[PDB]
Ligand binder design. Structure first.
Ligand SMILES: O=c1ccn([C@@H]2O[C@H](COP(=O)(O)OP(=O)(O)O[C@H]3O[C@H](CO)[C@@H](O)[C@H](O)[C@H]3O)[C@@H](O)[C@H]2O)c(=O)[nH]1
Length: 446
């Protein structure tokens, strides 16, 4: 017998849908008189959907992704999806209400889906926005109007941000998400993100898979901008997953064979980016030179293009796989450092295991800002000389993290940040309390 019905609208691209589903599952676990309907593309849903994931109170729906009836590009697909919005979702929300017999009482959406505000307003329900990155990235976007008003789109560098954005004084204009400055015939995603900024102050709550204590001053600032600003993470600590009885990748058996704690260099650039094959070569040379053991998530093509005899010579030193069980890898006692593209989920996984970072961010999104925070605010890792994996830059970064006095300070900082994350999700912790507040908002008087 359900009393409340929460509609949840995902953004079906990048690493957006999974973190939102995780929050839905956490809320569903605690909300047995509340029904949750999750709306996403059929293609995304087929990647996301065992005993702990079969909820009596979660229904899954597909919405039209806007493609004709993929042959075109990821870029193309995102534009068609946004062109079909919000009518694609509106039609399916009706179906969920008819099938369940319960009108929606609340709408949670990815924060990118600005039109969640319009759908919630039309239905006379609260809109809750789930931001899929850290507070620092959200703050950068929220100051878009003030940034553009101060310096325009086309002295400002290292003066404006330190005067304007609480807690981002260490960031440069060139660290900020580039979509802030894309206002000439903006692409559909830039349009969507700038409409998000305009709507978010009319959210009933903004929800983050972060913890307040990673950036107290930014958190306090954003609490002043939003009705409710609710850091509820890290989800991976609040809500662990039982260890799978096996690991078909071989990674964990290989890490178990390592004889030195904190010795292994784990390398991943995410699900999409591959560095250019001359940068992969430079990294391969640094690994052979430094003789740290390594575990590298790299696609089989890129691997086949590494330098002649590198794979044969390093057979007994490193393991290269097309996919790693990354959270399980980072939790392994043998891992000493993570060479990352500075995606938020990767950084947060690293914090949650006390693994320091070597940062190689690529263009777009919040990766460059995250790299700045890692080196100059959080102080849980280092960036590279020239922002590339040159052999000299890579040997230098590995030395700074693995065998310097600066390295010992970085490891105390990442251990302290791990402790703050754990405290946040335990009873009386900031994230624990914020998640109870979120339950009060969604489940209403009861
Ligand atoms: O072999 C691998 C490689 C990656 N991962 C996982 O893949 C995810 C990668 O996510 P993330 O580190 O956040 O990278 P991006 O998806 O590039 O992240 C950017 O884009 C996301 C939306 O697409 C935003 O939510 C992020 O904040 C933003 O930083 C993580 O959970 C990793 O554990 C694996 O499990 N195995």
């Amino acid at each position: 017998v359900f009393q409340s019905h929460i509609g949840v609208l995902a953004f079906p691209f990048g690493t957006h849908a999974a973190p939102l589903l995780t929050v839905v599952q956490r809320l569903a676990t605690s909300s047995p008189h509340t029904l949750f309907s999750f709306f996403n593309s059929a293609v995304s849903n087929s990647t996301l959907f065992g005993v702990l994931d079969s909820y009596d109170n979660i229904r899954v729906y597909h919405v039209w992704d806007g493609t004709p009836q993929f042959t075109g590009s990821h870029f193309e697909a995102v534009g068609l999806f946004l062109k079909a919005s919000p009518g694609n979702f509106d039609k399916v929300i009706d179906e969920a209400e008819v099938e369940t017999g319960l009108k929606i009482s609340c709408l949670i959406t990815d924060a990118f889906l600005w039109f969640g505000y319009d759908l919630a307003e039309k239905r006379g329900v609260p809109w809750l926005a789930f931001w899929t990155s850290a507070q620092c990235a959200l703050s950068a976007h929220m100051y878009t109007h003030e940034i553009l008003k101060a310096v325009g789109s086309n002295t400002a560098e290292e003066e404006l941000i330190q005067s304007l954005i609480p807690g981002l004084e260490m960031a440069h204009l060139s660290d900020l998400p580039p979509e802030i400055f894309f206002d000439k015939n903006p692409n559909p995603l830039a349009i969507t993100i700038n409409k998000m900024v305009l709507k978010l102050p009319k959210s009933t709550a903004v929800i983050l898979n972060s913890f307040e204590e990673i950036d107290p001053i930014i958190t306090t600032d954003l609490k002043s901008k939003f009705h409710h600003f609710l850091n509820i993470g890290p989800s991976i600590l609040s809500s662990p997953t039982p260890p799978p009885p096996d690991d078909k990748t071989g990674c964990l058996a290989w890490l178990d064979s390592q004889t030195r704690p904190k010795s292994v260099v784990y390398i991943s650039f995410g699900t999409v980016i591959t560095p250019p094959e001359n940068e992969l070569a430079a990294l391969s040379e640094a690994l052979e030179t430094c003789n740290y053991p390594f575990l590298w998530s790299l696609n089989d093509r890129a691997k086949k293009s590494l330098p002649t005899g590198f794979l044969d010579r390093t057979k007994e030193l490193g393991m290269i796989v097309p996919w790693a069980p990354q959270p399980r890898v980072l939790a392994h006692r043998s891992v000493g450092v993570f060479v990352t593209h500075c995606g938020w989920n990767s950084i947060l996984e690293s914090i949650c295991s006390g693994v320091p970072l070597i940062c190689r961010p690529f263009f777009g999104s919040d990766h460059k800002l995250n790299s700045r925070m890692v080196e100059d605010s959080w102080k849980i890792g280092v960036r590279l000389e020239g922002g590339v994996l040159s052999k000299t830059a890579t040997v230098e970064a590995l030395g700074r993290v693995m065998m310097s006095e600066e390295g010992e300070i970085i490891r105390e900082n990442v251990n302290e940040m791990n402790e703050k994350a754990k405290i946040a999700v335990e009873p009386k912790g900031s994230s624990f309390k914020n998640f109870n507040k979120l339950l009060e908002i969604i489940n209403a008087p009861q």
